[PDB]
Motif scaffolding. Structure first.
Motif, PDB file in Angstrom:
ATOM      1  N   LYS B  85       6.726  -2.374  -0.936  1.00 25.75           N
ATOM      2  CA  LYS B  85       6.089  -2.254  -2.307  1.00 25.75           C
ATOM      3  C   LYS B  85       5.093  -0.788  -1.917  1.00 25.75           C
ATOM      4  CE  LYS B  85       3.345  -3.791  -6.222  1.00 25.75           C
ATOM      5  NZ  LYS B  85       2.416  -4.686  -6.719  1.00 25.75           N
ATOM      6  N   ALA B  86       4.245  -1.003  -0.938  1.00 23.95           N
ATOM      7  CA  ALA B  86       3.313  -0.156  -0.391  1.00 23.95           C
ATOM      8  C   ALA B  86       4.260   1.234  -0.220  1.00 23.95           C
ATOM      9  CB  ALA B  86       2.592  -0.727   0.970  1.00 23.95           C
ATOM     10  N   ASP B  87       5.397   1.185   0.318  1.00 25.66           N
ATOM     11  CA  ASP B  87       6.196   2.340   0.671  1.00 25.66           C
ATOM     12  C   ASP B  87       6.483   2.906  -0.520  1.00 25.66           C
ATOM     13  OD1 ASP B  87       6.320   2.539   3.430  1.00 25.66           O
ATOM     14  OD2 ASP B  87       7.831   1.081   3.636  1.00 25.66           O
ATOM     15  N   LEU B  88       6.888   2.080  -1.623  1.00 32.89           N
ATOM     16  CA  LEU B  88       7.355   2.731  -3.087  1.00 32.89           C
ATOM     17  C   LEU B  88       6.316   3.539  -3.567  1.00 32.89           C
ATOM     18  CD1 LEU B  88       9.161   0.115  -4.876  1.00 32.89           C
ATOM     19  CD2 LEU B  88      10.439   2.459  -4.195  1.00 32.89           C
ATOM     20  N   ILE B  89       5.063   3.013  -3.394  1.00 30.67           N
ATOM     21  CA  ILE B  89       3.765   3.563  -3.875  1.00 30.67           C
ATOM     22  C   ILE B  89       3.169   4.823  -3.196  1.00 30.67           C
ATOM     23  CG2 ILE B  89       1.310   3.269  -4.735  1.00 30.67           C
ATOM     24  CD1 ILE B  89       2.037   0.146  -4.886  1.00 30.67           C
ATOM     25  N   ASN B  90       3.327   4.969  -1.837  1.00 27.71           N
ATOM     26  CA  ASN B  90       3.325   5.886  -1.000  1.00 27.71           C
ATOM     27  C   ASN B  90       4.263   6.984  -1.093  1.00 27.71           C
ATOM     28  OD1 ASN B  90       1.323   3.793   0.324  1.00 27.71           O
ATOM     29  ND2 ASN B  90       0.240   5.769   0.546  1.00 27.71           N
ATOM     30  N   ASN B  91       4.550   7.351  -2.124  1.00 29.29           N
ATOM     31  CA  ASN B  91       5.424   8.466  -2.562  1.00 29.29           C
ATOM     32  C   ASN B  91       6.858   7.827  -1.951  1.00 29.29           C
ATOM     33  OD1 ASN B  91       3.663  10.186  -4.145  1.00 29.29           O
ATOM     34  ND2 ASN B  91       2.805  10.202  -2.068  1.00 29.29           N
ATOM     35  N   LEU B  92       7.392   6.728  -2.101  1.00 25.88           N
ATOM     36  CA  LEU B  92       8.805   6.494  -1.505  1.00 25.88           C
ATOM     37  C   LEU B  92       8.854   6.664   0.056  1.00 25.88           C
ATOM     38  CD1 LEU B  92       9.107   7.685  -4.738  1.00 25.88           C
ATOM     39  CD2 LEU B  92      11.149   6.933  -4.268  1.00 25.88           C
ATOM     40  N   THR B  94       7.272   8.783   1.805  1.00 27.84           N
ATOM     41  CA  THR B  94       7.521  10.216   2.375  1.00 27.84           C
ATOM     42  C   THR B  94       5.820  10.623   2.437  1.00 27.84           C
ATOM     43  OG1 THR B  94       7.174  11.151   0.041  1.00 27.84           O
ATOM     44  CG2 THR B  94       9.527  10.796   1.093  1.00 27.84           C
ATOM     45  N   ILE B  95       5.678  11.603   3.129  1.00 25.16           N
ATOM     46  CA  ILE B  95       4.194  12.345   3.583  1.00 25.16           C
ATOM     47  C   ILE B  95       4.206  13.575   2.420  1.00 25.16           C
ATOM     48  CG2 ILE B  95       3.562  12.202   5.686  1.00 25.16           C
ATOM     49  CD1 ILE B  95       4.742  14.778   6.391  1.00 25.16           C
ATOM     50  N   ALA B  96       4.376  13.099   0.978  1.00 25.48           N
ATOM     51  CA  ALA B  96       4.784  13.970  -0.087  1.00 25.48           C
ATOM     52  C   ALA B  96       3.591  14.838  -0.558  1.00 25.48           C
ATOM     53  CB  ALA B  96       5.147  13.157  -1.217  1.00 25.48           C
ATOM     54  N   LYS B  97       2.464  14.628   0.074  1.00 26.75           N
ATOM     55  CA  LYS B  97       1.188  15.654  -0.425  1.00 26.75           C
ATOM     56  C   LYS B  97       1.365  16.780   0.672  1.00 26.75           C
ATOM     57  CE  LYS B  97      -3.727  15.979  -0.475  1.00 26.75           C
ATOM     58  NZ  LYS B  97      -4.932  15.384  -0.816  1.00 26.75           N
ATOM     59  N   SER B  98       1.134  16.504   1.943  1.00 29.98           N
ATOM     60  CA  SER B  98       1.291  17.475   2.839  1.00 29.98           C
ATOM     61  C   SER B  98       2.733  18.168   2.862  1.00 29.98           C
ATOM     62  CB  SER B  98       0.916  17.233   4.130  1.00 29.98           C
ATOM     63  OG  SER B  98       1.686  15.878   4.688  1.00 29.98           O
ATOM     64  N   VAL B 121      10.220  16.156   1.151  1.00 29.58           N
ATOM     65  CA  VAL B 121      10.351  15.670  -0.129  1.00 29.58           C
ATOM     66  C   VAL B 121      11.537  16.047  -0.903  1.00 29.58           C
ATOM     67  CG1 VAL B 121       7.843  16.146  -0.356  1.00 29.58           C
ATOM     68  CG2 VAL B 121       9.431  17.906  -1.049  1.00 29.58           C
ATOM     69  N   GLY B 122      12.837  15.879  -0.312  1.00 26.91           N
ATOM     70  CA  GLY B 122      14.035  16.101  -1.084  1.00 26.91           C
ATOM     71  C   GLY B 122      14.338  15.033  -2.048  1.00 26.91           C
ATOM     72  N   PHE B 123      13.662  14.003  -1.863  1.00 27.69           N
ATOM     73  CA  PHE B 123      14.316  13.023  -3.067  1.00 27.69           C
ATOM     74  C   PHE B 123      13.686  13.430  -4.280  1.00 27.69           C
ATOM     75  CE2 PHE B 123      11.971  10.079  -6.029  1.00 27.69           C
ATOM     76  CZ  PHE B 123      12.813   9.386  -6.339  1.00 27.69           C
ATOM     77  N   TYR B 124      12.591  14.384  -4.455  1.00 28.77           N
ATOM     78  CA  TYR B 124      12.299  14.878  -5.819  1.00 28.77           C
ATOM     79  C   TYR B 124      13.269  15.918  -6.182  1.00 28.77           C
ATOM     80  CZ  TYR B 124       8.261  12.123  -4.542  1.00 28.77           C
ATOM     81  OH  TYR B 124       7.491  11.325  -4.225  1.00 28.77           O
ATOM     82  N   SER B 125      14.288  16.314  -5.596  1.00 29.85           N
ATOM     83  CA  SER B 125      15.156  17.234  -5.874  1.00 29.85           C
ATOM     84  C   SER B 125      16.286  16.452  -6.879  1.00 29.85           C
ATOM     85  CB  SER B 125      16.015  17.863  -4.733  1.00 29.85           C
ATOM     86  OG  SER B 125      16.906  17.039  -4.210  1.00 29.85           O
ATOM     87  N   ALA B 126      16.038  15.136  -6.890  1.00 30.78           N
ATOM     88  CA  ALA B 126      16.803  14.318  -8.154  1.00 30.78           C
ATOM     89  C   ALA B 126      16.506  14.737  -9.479  1.00 30.78           C
ATOM     90  CB  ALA B 126      16.256  12.921  -7.917  1.00 30.78           C
TER      91      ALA B 126
END
Ligand SMILES: Cc1n[nH]c2cc(O)ccc12
Ligand SMILES: Cc1n[nH]c2cc(O)ccc12
Lengths: 208, 208
Positions: B85-92, B94-98, B121-126
């Protein structure tokens, strides 16, 4: 004090293929080792997001490139997650046995050696230029180790009482006699600019 | 039962840039989601090397592509490490902020959107094709969760009592009305063959 290990048969074949295949585009070794470092920096960064004290061993996240014409070494240093002794032994943290399988079936279907990082084994591309590779490493959960191999089927591991490094991994490339172009500032710069232009950690090229 | 969260400001801008930039080469979303799945499969495989019982939740390591013209969904399923659950919340995970920072400074220096996976961050390309993405996930260390977002700044998380899946991650793409070409067998095949030819896990394209 020094333990000696055999590479699994598949990793041994991989290292032998890398060492023995005629293949001119050798400069890719630097792209692959910088991308490994960047992977290891991502990891400690991700961990620090939930536990800040993980960065107690060094808050700076960077990559340094250290040429030395005297010892004929090129050293890649990162302040990433580093590796435990178990990791060093399990092929430096890689899935190298299945990675080599996939890389080999890709070579069969018309891939070339430059695609080696796609299969998780780009570290071994070091043997395009290095006759010996020495990896010094420190993970938060363990002590500081030195891994070394000149290929030929075996590697050593020992606890390292050299320079305490805090956290991360130094890859020391002892270059083949005909590969000292990679100790040249200009040549290193060109490679980094060409292949590693958008790495998200500062890369410092040291000067001599 | 349903918790609602805000994306960090940088991830919100990223999703908005992806949704709003005119950019024709949309098919890359599939390469990036398959490569994420392959990363997650590597992880459970690496872990299993030292602890075999990690694979008690499923020994098969694969990727399935499931189009459904009725619900207008394309589903990518992997039996990788899955997410807590923690992983899902920390942007799936990823280190998505940096990662977004680096991706943005790369766009400033003449990179294009197709290089998004280089920055983690290639996930967000969805969101090039999907108006809503639903991620169902199960990591050995936790229960089964559903993450969902239609962008606009927020996402939800809930414990999922749908179909028990054993271990891994399902990414359900609810396609934009003008993007149903990605439900076509022929179109999917071409993309996988073009961009994901040498992935080391079997990819099965389901038929309808
Ligand atoms: C493997 C490997 N090659 N280079 C590395 C650098 C690291 O920080 C960790 C692992 C590797
Ligand atoms: C993030 C992400 N996108 N797709 C994935 C698939 C996974 O198995 C884990 C994480 C992700």
């Amino acid at each position: 004090e020094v333990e000696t290990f055999a590479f699994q048969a598949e990793i041994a074949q991989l290292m032998s293929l890398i060492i023995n295949t005629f293949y001119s585009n050798k400069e890719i070794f630097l792209r692959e080792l910088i991308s490994n470092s960047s992977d290891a920096l991502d990891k400690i960064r991700y961990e620090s997001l939930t536990d800040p004290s993980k960065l107690d061993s060094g808050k700076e996240l960077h990559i340094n490139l250290i040429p030395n014409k005297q010892d004929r070494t090129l050293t890649i240093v990162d302040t990433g997650i580093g590796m435990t002794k178990a990791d060093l032994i399990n092929n430096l943290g890689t899935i190298a046995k299945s990675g080599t399988k996939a890389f080999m079936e890709a070579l069969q279907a018309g891939a070339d050696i430059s695609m080696i990082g796609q299969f998780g084994v780009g570290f071994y591309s070091a043997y395009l230029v290095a006759e010996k590779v020495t990896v010094i490493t420190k993970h938060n959960d363990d002590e500081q180790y030195a891994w070394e191999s000149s290929a030929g089927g075996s590697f050593t591991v020992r606890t390292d009482t050299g320079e305490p490094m805090g956290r991360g991994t130094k890859v020391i490339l002892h270059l083949k006699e005909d590969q000292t172009e990679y100790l040249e500032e200009r040549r290193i710069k060109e490679i980094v600019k060409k292949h590693s232009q958008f790495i998200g950690y500062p890369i410092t090229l040291f000067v001599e």
